[PDB]
Ligand binder design. Structure first.
Ligand SMILES: Cc1ncc(C[n+]2csc(CCOP(=O)(O)OP(=O)(O)O)c2C)c(N)n1
Ligand SMILES: Cc1ncc(C[n+]2csc(CCOP(=O)(O)OP(=O)(O)O)c2C)c(N)n1
Ligand SMILES: Cc1ncc(C[n+]2csc(CCOP(=O)(O)OP(=O)(O)O)c2C)c(N)n1
Ligand SMILES: [Mn+2]
Ligand SMILES: [Mn+2]
Ligand SMILES: [Mn+2]
Lengths: 539, 187, 541, 540
């Protein structure tokens, strides 16, 4: 075979050995060698391939495929602006610690500065955003060197995989893997015995014990990426939706300002709540930061210490637990009474109804803006359900594709267990602007994998709901409802969609329907300020 | 300017025992690019009282030779009318022609720092210095109108003499050899 | 307030520099110079365009820049702004379009301890921009208002010169940061002049060329006009300006043997062109503007900006080239007539025949721009745009909308009905940037823009290439054809954009009719026969 | 002024974080934190070091860092600072040295319109540093004095943790900016750092069977592995040794190991390179930090620890020990046979003179190899070499900085300070000869001896393919690079005591403390170097 073909088939083989189950491919002529190798691997069942047109939403599809079951995911695309389009997903992957491998074809590096068509500064384009920028040597037709070239190609691929999954750093993140390719682009030295990676690097244990005294009046705030802390299970915990919960003592975010914790344990990376953000900017309250990797958040200026786990002396005062438990009931009861007293249906109403419809085993995908916060205000109990949200930079790009990839990988893992049950549900909740913005994520070629059990709930208040919760001339577009027809968008991409009012939501989610469908619920944002002001006055 | 020509190399790195691929016929460059002529004419009226400050990389301007000129040592001088650096703060020019990239003198910097005197930047290449907040225009050469006023040339010539004399007299009266004495000797 | 004064001075000097349009995206924080820009848009001094999609917003700015040749600002202000603007900036760099990216750092805030709300940085700014200039924070002392006004306007003129290539003739994107602290204008020059005046510049590099040698001209993106080469047989790309009246069809090139080649601009189309430019037996003379010259093979003999000619082309060479031109036009025309199914080449021929002088034509990448060249469009009197810097299929809808708006604005200034802007893109290109159709009622909307979508449900260009060989038939369909079945009409209706699916012989009459708005015409096309259509054309050469 | 408070808070947190030494260079603008640094220097809380040459200054900071293992700051002030600090920063990255570069940008001036005479930036900061952190401008808020104190100390701690690798175990250079316009808020009680980072472990155990014929190659950055202490070990000079079973580098080509345990990053000996790339030998890389060495890609597994089963065959150990004795005797014997003093002769003399408690700084080229071939037993001695990029630049100031830091450690425990001995070649000495220029106001080492082995050029190119006599006609000028410098005159110019001695007088001269910082030059020959090595292997 010609050199580019051999090299592309070697990289694909080593990626599979390294645990890559899904690849997102974007069409282009330069990445033909990788495209051909990937397709052959998909036909043999070694990987599941996913073809997409738009590289930017393809990047978020890769992220969804990664966060759905925790595997490293590769997205492959041609040279030129197709690589520049991966920028936003790479930034999200960096801040959410997502093992996203950006595998870009390229022209030979000596062609830079020569006016070559469709060529740019690709190596290092992402700069600080990636854990590693690694490049393969332009394959040469040296039939004697093929054994050594095979070692170097598989080795570089293992470096890419380890950096992406944080195998040595415990800090998973995006990696840029650039392969310069020369003609011919159109058409295999073996790896290790027994399907082992070429260079085997086991996942690291990263340990940093930290002494904390629990008899001090303590609240836990757990954000995105938090670990599980059994010795902290009893403590009152203000847990973000994507935070996995150690215990059964939730503390509503609105209950925080009504409490005076003597110290705060912060798990992972908190993003969401203004009461949380205010409290953490309090120099007077000591904060201990526990994280699963080397990074720790700078949100609090009085982070006394860092660790991966706590070494606890003492126990919390029974009176402290009793009081926090009371304030939690008090907060969520205020929310539910003010929602009932509210005449109009809002996205908060929709999020409350969505939270009620969930069952253990569900996967829940939340969009940025009001959905992910509305679910927290509605008091969702997240134990037993996997909750995903692009909390890295909390942008609106790619949310639809993130929900699709997450459903697909969540369903692939389920086929793997051998259960003959229906695949578990993935339910998404996204705002209307977010949905329209990424509506082209609905596009899936007829040949391409389609989720079997994904329902996307669009809470449509015909604009930007969170701006009621407060400017620039840039805000003038929000001053007018957009009137984009959600139903017409869904038929453009041949996706089942229906409008329903909020009481139909429970019953409609309970019936499976088409493998992928959209439930639009009309909402009102004109009354949002009134509703939220009524909630605070009730506390 | 500088460019970075990086060459990846691997073994064998030394010549084998001894056929070099040829270049173009007659020793010519493989791709021949003649040196560009960069031209940007700029109208300046010289009857307005003008001083010329010449910095590093300054061009040569015959149509400005009569003007009082403060030229750095590296500046290729083209005028016949020098103005000493120390005479500049005792003059008040109505406009300034700035040649190349001035770097050396604090009063030059102070004069160019004043936002009230219009500065015309005449340079050899596309770059031009940002030492003056009041650069009206850029060019490579001047298309002149008028001539410097006789009274203006007398003042500059007069202050120029004072500065030369002050340096020369005070060096002669100084008891100790200094670096300024060494500079005058070398000069 | 010092910041406020600074912002009005900067915005005023930008306007003096010829900035007519500024593109903004709502973000976490307040846009650069937001209040100053807001005042100027009320006075009608400047025109603002707002989008939610940051990627489409950069390409909208590219369009507003290439529509009439004016520098355009994008003030974008979020943690995904740099990532989404990257594609537009890379294109602005390689196509040399004056795109000023506005940012606003907070020197009073920390950096590098975590995610940055203002400006999450990538690695491309350092390699794609002509300059990175950052104003000082506005210091609060009124003795120096005259001094600070001069510094701010000088720096703004420095930003504009870098963007327009005023002194370098190498236009491109520049980064302009106006720092800020949370939470009557010092006047510029008289008569509305820019603070630092940059008079016209010439980079002169004459090359001696003998035209008696059999010479062909290949002119590409960014090509200049050369009256002394007007008679030469010229294979001109659609974005290249014509110097003369002697065209040579691209398909006729392999049927000829030029003894030498004069290359104008940056060629990006046709494999016979790249083969000829690489032929070590053919001296290639590159005439371009700017620092670099195109030469993928490194075979070029010399580069300059202008030719000094001796002699004239042999009349035998002219008739030989003219005769292959005729056969090439004949081959395309007849085989299109003999082909039952409508392809994008059919659509490109129909669009070309409907064009008239004064039109603006916007061409998407892939087959459209090549197909227009194959249809032998006469580009004289026509303004033709295409994003040939990187030749991406992304961002083309907003590029066409922006170019329509800029070209209509220049016409509104003459005082004269706006001229037509007609766009031809493939279906993948349309799908990629369909969100660009989303224009708020608060926002400028073109009056004379017709986007023509040639829809063969996939990437037809891959039928023609390596992957299009029938031996590759099973696999190639999925990874190169990428069919999608998107319903264009439903998509346009969702965005409140007038749309209609029409047959190709309806295209001419429909384009002639005033649609009195932005609209989308869809023409169904076939790509399963594209490879055999082209083979039939070549056989008829 | 709010900035002086900020500056004193930063310096106070830096001191709380283990920074004992700060290097400054004069320039057109005030150094970052200068008043706060000179405050702290006068009171003894921190030790400043001033130099005129910015490049030797960065390498002085590296020496100050690796001498006792503490982070050190370099704060500089010119349009040439970034360019001159470049080499030291690249070494800090690749050798994982915690070097904090302080800058002071000015938010009220224009950027990008001309030449900044602070921080004229190049392109290497993106690739080299572990972090790039800038404080905000200090602002008017007595009301916010507590919160701003919390933010400034947290960020400083973030700078220190990134540079020392407290959480990543990947120490390296950090860029720390304290911007400037142009009664200090307390830290934590008992001198605690504002954000405490408890000790961290990265654990990746790899199963390894020792019954397979195994050799250990340990290089720069290698850890200490007690379960591998008895294995035959080819240890580079800077590699800390686990045991007492050395394997001479020249015995390797005569052995056929079935598997390799490689600790840290090796850079010496082609036979090490060929063995590491041999496709039939499994290679297990045990290192700390994010990446692993593998030029050929041949490695089978990477981690941090070995979990071992089995024991080596006695015949394998017996033959490894036999070839080791064969190689050591071959070098001694031909050194005794060889008449002319060569750098190899000098390295053996220096090794024999060393004693536990010494610090040994080695230059690149033949010096660091020659010590390995002389067979120094490095246990009890702390060996330093700039192996990150293996440059011949900055070795004088590196040695000066290491001796100062090592002697400072000896003071804080409350006799005469331990010896620091540096062996460098003549080209290396000439390269960084301006490190010898130390002002009277600056700290000077007490027990630093620098041995310069001068064969009037680069002896290493005599051992390579260009040293072949078919290149006798052309190798001298482009590779030998003879220079004829008078080392004695050079040391006299900077008022540093220097001496010519012969190899047999080296030990006696090194024993006695000497008046502080001194240079001993030993004359050497490189014309006979290729034959001398030819003789040594010819005896194998
Ligand atoms: C702080 C911030 N504001 C605005 C944006 C851009 N943005 C984020 S959410 C949003 C509107 C969300 O509307 P929708 O998706 O309908 O959800 P809703 O808030 O209405 O529930 C915009 C414009 C951003 N990235 N960050
Ligand atoms: C952002 C980007 N991604 C991928 C490519 C590679 N590419 C070039 S042409 C093409 C097909 C375009 O299809 P369409 O716009 O429908 O035009 P057609 O080929 O159908 O005429 C693709 C995917 C590109 N040029 N830009
Ligand atoms: C800055 C730098 N320049 C060049 C080299 C290449 N180089 C490696 S060894 C060497 C010779 C060193 O000579 P010397 O210090 O006298 O040691 P010797 O080999 O003579 O013992 C050179 C030039 C390098 N490593 N670093
Ligand atoms: Mn909404
Ligand atoms: Mn198509
Ligand atoms: Mn030497």
């Amino acid at each position: 075979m010609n050199p580019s073909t051999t090299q592309a088939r070697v990289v694909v083989d080593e990626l599979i050995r390294g645990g890559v189950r899904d690849v997102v491919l974007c069409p282009g002529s330069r990445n033909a060698p990788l495209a051909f190798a990937l397709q052959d691997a998909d036909r043999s069942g070694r990987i599941r391939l996913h073809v997409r047109i738009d590289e930017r939403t393809a990047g978020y599809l890769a992220i969804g495929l990664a966060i759905g079951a925790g595997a490293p995911v590769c997205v492959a695309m041609t040279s030129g602006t197709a690589v520049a389009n991966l920028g936003p997903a790479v930034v999200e992957a960096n801040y959410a610690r997502v093992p996203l491998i950006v595998l870009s074809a390229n022209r030979p590096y000596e062609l830079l500065g020569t006016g070559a068509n469709q060529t740019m500064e690709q190596l290092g384009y992402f700069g600080t955003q990636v854990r590693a920028s690694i490049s393969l040597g332009l394959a040469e037709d040296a039939p004697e060197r093929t054994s050594a070239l095979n070692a170097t190609w598989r080795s570089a691929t293992c470096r890419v995989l380890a950096a992406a999954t944080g195998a040595r750093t415990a800090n998973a993140g995006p990696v840029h893997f650039d392969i310069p390719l020369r003609e011919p682009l159109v058409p295999t030295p073996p790896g290790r015995p027994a399907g082992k990676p070429w260079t085997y690097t086991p996942p690291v244990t990263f340990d940093q014990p930290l002494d904390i005294d629990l008899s001090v009046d303590t609240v836990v705030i757990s954000g995105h990426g938090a670990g599980v802390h059994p010795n902290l299970a009893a403590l009152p915990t203000v847990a973000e939706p994507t935070a996995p919960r150690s215990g059964d003592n939730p503390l509503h975010p609105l209950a925080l300002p009504l409490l005076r914790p003597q110290q705060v344990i912060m798990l992972g990376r908190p993003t969401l709540h203004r009461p949380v953000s205010v409290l953490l900017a309090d120099a007077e309250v000591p904060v201990f930061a526990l994280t699963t990797g080397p990074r720790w958040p700078d949100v609090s200026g009085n982070s006394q210490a860092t660790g991966t786990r706590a070494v606890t002396t003492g126990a919390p005062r029974p009176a402290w637990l009793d009081r926090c438990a009371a304030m939690n009931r008090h907060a969520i009861a205020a929310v539910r009474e003010q929602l009932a007293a509210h005449p109009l249906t809002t996205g908060l109403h929709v999020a409350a109804a969505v939270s009620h419809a969930l069952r253990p085993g569900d996967q829940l995908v939340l969009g940025a803006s009001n959905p992910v916060r509305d679910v927290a205000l509605a008091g969702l109990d997240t134990r037993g359900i996997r909750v995903r949200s692009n909390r890295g930079v909390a942008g609106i790009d790619g949310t639809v594709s993130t929900a699709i990839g997450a459903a697909l990988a969540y369903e692939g893992a389920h086929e793997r267990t051998g259960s003959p049950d229906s695949p578990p549900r993935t339910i998404a909740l996204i705002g209307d602007l977010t949905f329209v913005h990424d509506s082209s994520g609905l596009l899936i070629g007829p040949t391409e994998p389609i989720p079997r059990s994904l329902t996307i709930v669009v809470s449509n208040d015909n604009g930007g709901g969170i701006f009621e919760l407060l400017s620039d001339v840039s805000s003038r577009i929000f001053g007018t409802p957009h009137d984009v027809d959600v139903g017409a968008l869904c038929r453009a991409y041949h996706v089942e969609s229906r409008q329903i009012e909020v009481d139909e939501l429970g019953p409609t989610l309970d019936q499976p329907g088409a493998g992928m469908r959209v439930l639009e619920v009309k909402a009102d944002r004109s009354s949002l300020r009134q509703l939220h002001a009524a909630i605070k006055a009730a506390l | 300017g500088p460019v970075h020509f990086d060459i990846p190399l691997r073994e064998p790195l030394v010549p084998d025992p001894e056929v070099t691929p040829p270049g173009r016929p007659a020793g010519k460059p493989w791709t021949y690019t003649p040196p560009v002529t960069f031209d940007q004419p700029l109208d300046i009226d010289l009857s307005v009282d003008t001083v010329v400050i010449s910095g590093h990389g300054a061009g040569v301007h015959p149509n400005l030779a009569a003007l009082p000129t403060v030229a750095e040592p590296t500046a290729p001088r083209s005028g016949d009318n020098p103005l000493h650096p120390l005479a500049l703060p005792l003059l008040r020019p109505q406009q300034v022609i700035m040649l190349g990239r001035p770097t050396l003198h604090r009063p030059v910097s102070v004069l160019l720092a004043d936002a009230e005197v219009p500065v015309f930047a005449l340079t050899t290449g596309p770059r031009w210095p940002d030492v003056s907040g009041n650069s009206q225009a850029t060019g490579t050469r001047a298309v002149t109108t008028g001539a410097p006023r006789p009274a203006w040339l007398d003042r500059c010539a007069a202050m120029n003499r004072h500065a030369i004399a002050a340096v020369r007299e005070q060096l002669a009266a100084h008891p100790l050899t200094t670096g300024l004495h060494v500079a005058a000797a070398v000069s």
